[PDB]
């Protein structure tokens, strides 16, 4: 569903 926000992937 959502895109990653812990690192700038």
């Amino acid at each position, epitope marked *: *569903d959502t*895109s*990653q*926000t*812990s690192s*700038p*992937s």
Partner: antibody
Amino acid sequence: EVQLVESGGGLVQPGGSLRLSCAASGFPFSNYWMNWVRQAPGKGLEWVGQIRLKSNNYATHYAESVKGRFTISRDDSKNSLYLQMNSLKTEDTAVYYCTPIDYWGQGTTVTVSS
Amino acid sequence: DIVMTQTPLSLSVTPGQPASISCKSSQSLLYSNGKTYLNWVLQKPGQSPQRLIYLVSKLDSGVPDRFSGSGSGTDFTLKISRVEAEDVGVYYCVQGSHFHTFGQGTKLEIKR
């Protein structure tokens, strides 16, 4: 449901090797940088190594304390993450988490002893 | 490498009262894409870690609004406005601007 499930933890001799695996569901795995993080008994969290995307050529990088001994790999077709651990030491004893940092599972426990 | 300096190492807070945790980074966490990758995770006693805060100030789902995150560059703060019993555990900051590293952890107990 987001799920991350580690396996392959166990007891192994100092100097032995072990290979951990990890399956994931419920998020776009193939668009996510994937990590191993560990926690030695009774201590903090420690990033071990990272693997980036296909469009990054699956670039990998490692904590200085495991560099040259561990290898992270992935397989986006299986939504899987792997850690090959060679030349294991006593201080590699930990719970090992397969994580993008956004999401976490239960972990698999690695004990390095004689 | 970016070293994360978290203080205090422990907090003992009466419910109703606030808690504050500092995380400082040895270099800027400002990424080249204009975003700042500072995250806070909570590891509740006997549980796996779980993220609470991402991109400095944003709350993950299910996180009470008593939780807030602030800061920029090298300086960040987690605030809990009115501690409740469920807040107990070890908090860690974790930067994602240069791979990942974690704060040393802040153990929160309830004062009674």
